[PDB]
């Protein structure tokens, strides 16, 4: 009837009659909108981290006795003289700061060195005999920040060592310009560990940062976060027009008994983001990069948006029309197959992990199969040699080839093939009793 | 009639025929002169170029008071004394120069060094109060090249420092051998800059050099450039080819009431590009590259050109043939479809970009998400760990799979689709009434 | 008849039939007991081999005098001083290990350096005679571990040198937290060759490490030594439900006058595996990562056995159909052609080898090859540039794109085709006279 | 008849009859024989040759006054008292080469150094005027191997300089376990260039070695030059079974008024091959490097014997028969798109190859694109960054995009095709006037 006319009808045919034309408008302004609420946005996300990341690298700068040739700090002490050297240069280097550390950063009124202890430790060598207590006793020491340092170490029961202290930084090219919290104390925490006891102490230096704005501010009601409510309005009357699109499925159902439902989880994520992002304005996380994630799951799905938009101008829509047709071999082949890949990542985890990667993580061996998957990788995992069985290294080729095999021969095959299949009844069946009794 | 055998007619049939084979002749001596107006060419462009960056990176190598282990100078300094370490090692840089360097490039009758200051600043960590004033006064200090060094610098305050200066360069090996402007001055500014105030001052030395004629030449009409003038007489002879090829093309709308307006674009391109090569011969600019652009679109179209030739002596061109079929559903596919590449180098963009790069610019996510497209990047991006948030890296993980799933179980196989089917009706048809009524 | 039933019957359907849901949450049992088994076997083998190498590349960070601002080792001596500069420094390493040594590790109640010399051998230069005699002499000496170093070597006559030494050291969060035998005394020998007789001698430090439990142990019947035996009573009551599966292929056999062959293939490996990880919890051997390969391919034929399960739900199975389905077409393409990539890699062998890698070895060779098939490497092989003759580099260029040409023009492709091929009638036959009877 | 017989006959059918099996088993004969020249042959080519880059990437190591943390050795002086420190260095290394080079390499009975000089210069900077004589007179030096050192240069006129040399070397694993002259003498020539005269002056050192045998031998009729003689014989028999063949082939003439031709041209490449590496047995050149590429050549067409064989097994030779079935639009595809490459090239190569590479040959941006064509380079192709002209990287995306598009949109699909189709052909007539007279 009329009805299957409203909503089998056509947006652009749509153009053809009166006083529809508002609804489209009305939702290219939801997508211009949503789409500066990223640009702006993403200048605040990565303006405010990487100036984290900047003053971090370089409290690294500051507080390593030592950086070497090579870039990767992977590397730690071989001595005594080492850790000792390195106390003497960061507990100095908290003297020291003030005249020579370049970046204004200073004490608030300091620091801290973590010592963790073995319970009853006995090493008998001579003969054989080997005595742990599974107990661990952390001993805290405190800095002041304004001389002489006392170290007090032993060396084979040492297990992990750290210091912490929280510096005070407030972010001048942040709040200058825009608007965004412009203090964040940098908690830093450097470590050094023999955890594994190996004669190797893995240092590194690691900082949480916490967002706190400054108790004054005078300089030389915000429209910037009135806008974001104001776009938070277009995102509330986009889950209003999300909601005349649920009483357009609503009256879908009524008359069957969904693009919109993409449109609506947008801006409802969209929705709940201008609210958490009003949220981490009150809140002053730090930690609300989630905040940015469930920001910007919006903007994927507004762009497929983008994808039914220009979809609408054309209307035969094949790209997404096959795609959508047989995403059903699609994602039983993924999950189905997905297993013949965990399968092998396994095997490649007891005989080929213990020889790939020095941090040797299953998750990282999962990663560059699907690596070699992405065709390089076969560079370094060939390049180091297992030399020490033949039997190794004999497996070693025989699965790398196996796999690399089942794929190019097997994977990208499959996919090339039901992608072949349903373009072709796609362009055939362009080339139902419902849509019989619709017209 | 007649004139459908002057119009469908075949170069090679019209080589049976007597005083036709003219034309082609002429076109042949277009392609190896514009070829050989590439080759002079690139001679050129390329030896003054890399005589520029040789001179250039080396003035690096004189002013930077060092270079480290590694090759990179993304590096800069932690210190006050290093930065006027910087400054006594490149002012007495450009008093040393004469003695040291050992380039010939000689001051010129008178440097500087610019300080970029802010109008009224505040820091009180104290009280946590913090205020700017957004307004930078520059002072501008003057080096007189022949030796004591003042300096005047706040910590706190300091945006930015450069220097700059212009040092004379006339190039040996280019106006020895063949025609090209000897002198380019390289004008020099040398930066430090807290621009984030970090405390790291990203230091780089960045050179414009601008191309001047030595005011005598005594050594030991020119018919290089007069060559360039004649090829440009091939060209202007070839949009005259172009012009009986465009009354050739208006005598077919006539009849009709293209290969060639490729043919002519080409030369058109080629003629403005010879009256500019004459142009930059005139002006001695330096950023002329452009009228190598200018030029080079030439080569290319010119060289489909090459692509019409070898089919003209197979003539039946299915590879072009089969290609210009379906670029419809080509172009269709690559700015539908490009949508959806660019909404996830916005997710990407928000949440993933903060983590990437230290440069962090959109840009360089966008083109590293094409970078997977090309299948190598896979190695560097899972490379560097997320950590801090276990939702982070799940994420991470999420997408990068996600995406770097929807094109290869999508991206390619679309692509080897359509190509395939439109290669089967190329090779059908090959196995119209307009055809009709001229048969 | 009733046989039929029970043969060619669905696990699912049988899920309506009572009494036999049984065995397969039996076999569930042993898929993630398996899995477990791999779990936890898997913390075993890396933490193991991770401390392994941990202490082992250390080895080489104490007794190396030196390392380089590149972090690759491939480099060594040109000089005298520097030879005997390697041993000051490491016989004193033996002597200083107590004291600078930042590990645990100690000696056991002890060195040695070996040096090959020449049986007969003389130089002349001068009239051009070079005698040489095929035997080696080889003079072991002994140190003590705790100063005075006495040094006897010739130059010319040094084939190669070497030092050998077995340090002790038990591994403390092996033993602390897990079973697994803490002690593993790292033999090490330390080389210096001259064996190509170059001017360069090739060092490297390598460590055979062997396992050995402490003789006692006070800390602060082993249930998951047991529970390795009672998933190994999973294993044998899987090889008995494999022997109830081979009685049921017995009986298959006679209604005949395998999905199965592949469960029990699997817990055979798993049950001589849970045998061998009792035989190398017996024997303490740590080249028992045999054990582990053994232990592995149990893993993967048990996760094709997921690929069941999975296919098990769906029940129509395509993926794994239409594999199997033309793999003839597909051992037969791998076998066949790579006869061809065989004979490629010698034309590579004898004239591009020479110039490739400064390991010059075939099986890298082989091994690049194929990485070129994975898309990267053109970047490394295209950069070193031969130089010499033209005539070298101009067949470089014209078989590396020869065959990286055959196989994109021809390897995917074939591949690409009859994976396309039966892709086809999988989908058409799913929409014999032996099923005949059987219905 | 039985001529058709004896020609349309099955090697494997030829079984079934008597006293034909003695061919074939000739054949198989010289396939491991060709194989194993090849095999012995490459311990040959390659053991000498990994000596000279042995010995030769070592007087490198001798002669340079300095390595860097970069391995690269692309870098060259800045400085006046680094070129005379490169000159002490070098000229002091010919005085301690006796006692300090590690190597048994020496003096025969001696050094020199050339100096590339202006015939009359003129730079006048300050009235801009510049002069030059497109004159070099080479002055050379010569050094007596046994104290003080004199230098004379100007900086301004130094284009070139450079030192040769000659230094014997006799390989002493090589003539010690086989067959291989042991002596060559490795000509250098160490360079220091201001070629470009940009401030620096770009070093490198580089070796020719002119091969010699001892002139006495006294260690402790070669039957492994006549067993290459014995497979010369082999491949002489070889060619005279392709006389057989040959003359096969004139009976298959003179019946038709191949495979062959294949296995007849291989061993005569393998006979010229046996025969010259007989005549670089004779001539001791160093540069038979091309003796060596055309004894491969061999291997290679030896081994798509390999091919016929293999499917001489199965018969149907599918993979082989369908390559050859559409071979036709794969060279015609290959030459006519290749234009298409070429013109890119141009057009990277005046615009974009300026700005890519410091040796900023046509040539490597050819071969980086292909790079991308193997799906590797985007990451060092797009980090590298203009920014000098927005409308410089304006096109560079542009092109890059173009092109890296052009192919996978268009290179891989057409492939895929033709590919894919003479497939379907070739199962399709597996599933002529002449065989139906055959029959």
Chains 1, 2, 3, 4 share one sequence.
Not at 169 to 193: G, S
Not at 288 to 299: E, N, P, Q
Request: net charge neutral; aromatic share 14%.
């Amino acid at each position: 009837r009329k009805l299957k006319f409203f909503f089998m009808n056509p947006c652009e045919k749509f153009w053809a009659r009166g006083r529809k034309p508002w609804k489209l408008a009305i939702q290219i302004l939801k997508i211009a909108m949503v789409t500066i609420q990223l640009v702006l946005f993403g200048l605040s996300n990565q303006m405010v981290v990487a100036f984290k990341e900047e003053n971090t690298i370089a409290f690294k700068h500051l507080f390593l006795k030592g950086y070497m040739d090579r870039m990767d700090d992977t590397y730690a002490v071989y001595t005594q003289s080492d850790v000792y050297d390195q106390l003497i240069f960061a507990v100095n280097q908290y003297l020291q700061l003030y005249n020579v550390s370049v970046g204004n950063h200073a004490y608030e009124n300091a620091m801290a060195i973590c010592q963790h202890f073995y319970k009853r430790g006995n090493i008998y060598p001579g003969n054989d005999t080997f005595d742990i207590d599974p107990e661990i006793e952390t001993e805290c020491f405190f800095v002041e920040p304004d001389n002489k340092l006392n170290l007090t170490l032993d060396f084979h029961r040492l297990l992990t060592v750290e210091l912490q202290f929280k510096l005070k930084a407030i972010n001048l090219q942040t709040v200058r310009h825009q608007e965004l919290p412009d203090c964040y104390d940098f908690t830093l925490t450097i470590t050094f560990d023999n955890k594994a006891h190996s004669g190797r102490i893995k240092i590194s230096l690691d900082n949480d940062i916490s967002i706190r704005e400054c108790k004054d501010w005078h300089v030389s009601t915000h429209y910037m976060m009135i806008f974001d409510a104001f776009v938070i309005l277009t995102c509330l009357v986009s889950l209003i027009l999300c909601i005349r699109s649920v009483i357009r499925g609503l009256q879908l159902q009524q008359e069957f008994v969904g693009w919109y439902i993409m449109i609506i989880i947008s801006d409802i994520l969209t929705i709940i983001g201008s609210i958490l992002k009003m949220e981490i304005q009150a809140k002053s996380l730090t930690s609300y990069d989630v905040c940015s994630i469930l920001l910007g799951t919006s903007t994927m799905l507004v762009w497929l948006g983008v994808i039914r938009y220009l979809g609408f101008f054309a209307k035969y829509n094949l790209l997404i029309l096959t795609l959508q047709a047989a995403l059903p071999n699609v994602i039983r082949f993924c999950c189905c197959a997905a297993m013949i890949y965990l399968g092998y990542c396994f095997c490649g985890w007891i005989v080929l992990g213990p020889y790939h990667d020095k941090f040797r993580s299953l998750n990282m061996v999962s990663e560059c199969l699907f690596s070699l998957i992405n065709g390089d990788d076969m560079f370094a995992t060939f390049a180091k040699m297992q030399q020490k069985s033949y039997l190794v290294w004999l497996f070693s080729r025989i699965y790398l080839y196996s796999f690399i095999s089942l794929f190019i021969y097997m994977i990208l095959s499959l996919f090339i093939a039901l992608i072949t299949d349903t373009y072709e009844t796609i362009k055939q069946y362009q080339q139902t009793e419902l849509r019989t009794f619709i017209s």
